Design a protein around this nucleic acid. Structure first.
Lengths: 77, 119, 59, 52, 194
RNA sequence: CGCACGGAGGCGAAGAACCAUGGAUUUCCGAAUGAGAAUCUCUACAAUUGCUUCGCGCAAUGAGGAACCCCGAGAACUGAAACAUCUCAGUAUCGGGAGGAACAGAAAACGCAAUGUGAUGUCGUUAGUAACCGCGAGUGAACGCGAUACAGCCCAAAC
């Protein structure tokens, strides 16, 4: 039911959370990229400018949202 | 068979006519219900008139009412609407069947009407 | 022991969506720095703890 | 015909894992099967073998 | 009480019955397998075999085919007597009666059937009525009669599937003592099929 | 801190592990059921059907199961020292379906023919008897009896 899943941490991920503000994990194949946006922001206080999408392969979803010029890569709630 | 005119069908459902006086005779005395009981009355000539719905299903319950009405010599009428003669007898449900053994009260309009049929 | 499902199930859904992030953070946070130093029953405690909470509201 | 190659070269996907039957079994040029079930909604058997 | 609807359904060519037969199946024909019906066609026979107005009762027509044959041909190894071989000559043992009863029942999965029998049909298909019951219903599970055709379905289940019915339990059995050899000890199974 | 004997770390006397019972949670497809899909994805009892407040509102069916049981479809090798009927065999295999057992079952019976028996299975026997058959090879009961267990009833119609 939850749109969120847990952060996706990988080498590709850390680079994005480096150059590029951010990115993440995801879940809910049946999630849009608005849903992952709202439930991104709902989690922490940052505005997520744009979230892409990405099937996988993994059988899950990936969506890396990047923040909005005001928040860093959290890597810590 | 013979064709009734929607004028005769008024007056007595039991008689050739349509139901009206047929409500009388229940309030007055005598009637039958369905095909089963009505058939009995013809058998033991008790009913002056009996009616039959035109609609009928493929029931053919009312299939031997005629010829077995015309032996006994009981005049019987056709009504249109099983419901119509269903309602005159006090019945929520309609009945293809017939009636009036005694024909109380309307021993008058009834029997006058019978004359109309088979005039 | 710890949370023990008594307190859970007693609590409201909103409360449930509280104490479900309480463990979450101290959880994932243990996961980070887990690499730093490992954890003993804590993570593993927190999981299970968190686990139970989910299957409460989602029973 | 006989492996030459003349066969084996065929690089087409077929007979992948079926959704509900762990075995690959299900072809893609077919509909479903070559192991239990699908199309039949049951289990697949066949007495081509085991005596009953 | 319902005599002549018995009497009448004898000739089927007598008079009134025949005319209804002219206009009957005209509609039934051009009506496919599976129908349904408010009342049975013969009221004596329903309400004979077992049919009463009551909730939980449903009677359906059925059509079938006409003649019996329609069969596949054997593969090779035909040469022989031939034994089981043949083509259009063989008639299938099940009646186009028994066939009507199922092919009903497998329409309504839920309900079982005490089976009525056909009305006649021409140039092709025969018909049949077929009352069914309904097991988990009320009034059905009330009247002692028309109980036990639902207990709730512990033993009787897909009656007429197994076979236990009217036409079936006939067909593959009739009579009692005498000529019940190589027939129902219970039946064909046991005392290997005749 | 499962199988699972590791490394790290953690839980337990705030009585954990583990067991019983009850509850919570219980993604997607589905027998699989909103729809599609190689276990993912996209925005609702699918389908058939009964009742029906005619709305999926109340319900049913679907699939599984070691074999057993019931109803249908039904070979050939083989045997006859060939082979066609016969035989293998209503077997193998196939289709449909029930239950914890099925199926049968209270005589339009039996027929030791009787002033006699008295629902039905099953077991023993009757008996390789009667019967069948290139009258070849082969095939093959039943009534009765001794047992086991026993239990008899409801409609349609008349009124």
């Amino acid at each position: 039911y939850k749109v969120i899943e847990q952060p996706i941490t990988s080498e590709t991920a850390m680079k994005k959370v480096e150059d590029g503000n951010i990115l993440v994990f995801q879940v809910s194949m049946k999630a849009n990229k608005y849903q992952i946006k709202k439930a991104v922001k709902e989690l922490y206080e940052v505005d997520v400018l744009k979230v892409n999408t990405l099937v996988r392969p993994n059988g899950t979803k990936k969506a890396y949202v990047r923040l909005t010029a005001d928040y860093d890569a959290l890597d810590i709630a | 068979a013979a064709e009734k005119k929607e004028r005769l069908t008024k007056e007595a459902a039991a008689v050739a006519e349509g139901k009206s006086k047929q409500d009388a005779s229940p309030k007055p005395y005598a009637v039958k219900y369905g095909l089963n009981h009505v058939v009995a009355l013809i058998e033991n000539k008790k009913a002056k008139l009996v009616l039959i719905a035109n609609d009928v299903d493929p029931i053919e319950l009312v299939v031997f009412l005629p010829a077995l009405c015309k032996k006994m010599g009981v005049p019987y009428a056709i009504v249109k609407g099983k419901a119509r003669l269903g309602t005159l007898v006090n019945q929520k449900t309609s009945a293809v069947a017939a009636l009036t053994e005694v024909r109380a009260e309307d021993e008058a309009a009834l029997a006058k009407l019978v004359s109309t049929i088979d005039a | 022991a710890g949370v023990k499902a008594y307190e859970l199930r007693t609590k409201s859904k909103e409360q449930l969506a509280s104490q479900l992030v309480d463990l979450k953070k101290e959880l994932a946070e243990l996961k980070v720095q887990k690499l730093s130093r490992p954890s003993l029953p804590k993570i593993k405690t927190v999981r299970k703890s968190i686990a139970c909470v989910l299957t409460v509201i989602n029973e | 015909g006989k492996g030459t190659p003349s066969f084996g070269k065929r690089h087409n996907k077929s007979h992948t894992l079926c959704n509900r039957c762990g075995r690959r079994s299900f072809h893609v040029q077919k509909k479903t099967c070559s192991s239990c079930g699908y199309p039949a909604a049951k289990t697949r058997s066949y007495n081509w073998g085991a005596k009953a | 009480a319902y005599k002549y609807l018995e009497e009448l359904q004898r000739k089927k060519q007598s008079d009134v019955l025949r005319f209804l037969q002219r206009v009957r199946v005209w509609e039934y024909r051009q009506k496919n397998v599976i129908h349904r019906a408010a009342r049975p066609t013969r009221p004596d026979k329903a309400r004979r075999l077992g049919y009463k107005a009551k909730q939980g009762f449903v009677i359906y027509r059925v059509r079938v085919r006409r003649g019996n044959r329609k069969r596949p041909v054997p593969k090779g190894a035909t040469y022989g007597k031939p034994t089981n071989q043949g083509v259009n000559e063989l008639k299938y043992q099940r009646s186009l009666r028994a066939t009507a009863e199922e092919r009903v029942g497998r329409r309504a999965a839920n309900l079982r059937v005490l089976n009525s029998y056909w009305v006649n049909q021409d140039s092709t298909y025969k018909y049949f009525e077929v009352i069914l019951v309904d097991p988990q219903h009320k009034a059905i599970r009330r009247d002692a009669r028309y109980n036990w055709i639902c207990d709730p379905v512990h033993k009787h289940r897909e009656a007429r599937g197994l076979t236990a019915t009217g036409k079936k339990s006939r067909g593959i059995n009739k009579g009692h003592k005498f000529n019940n050899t190589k027939a129902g000890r219970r039946k064909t199974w046991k005392r290997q099929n005749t």
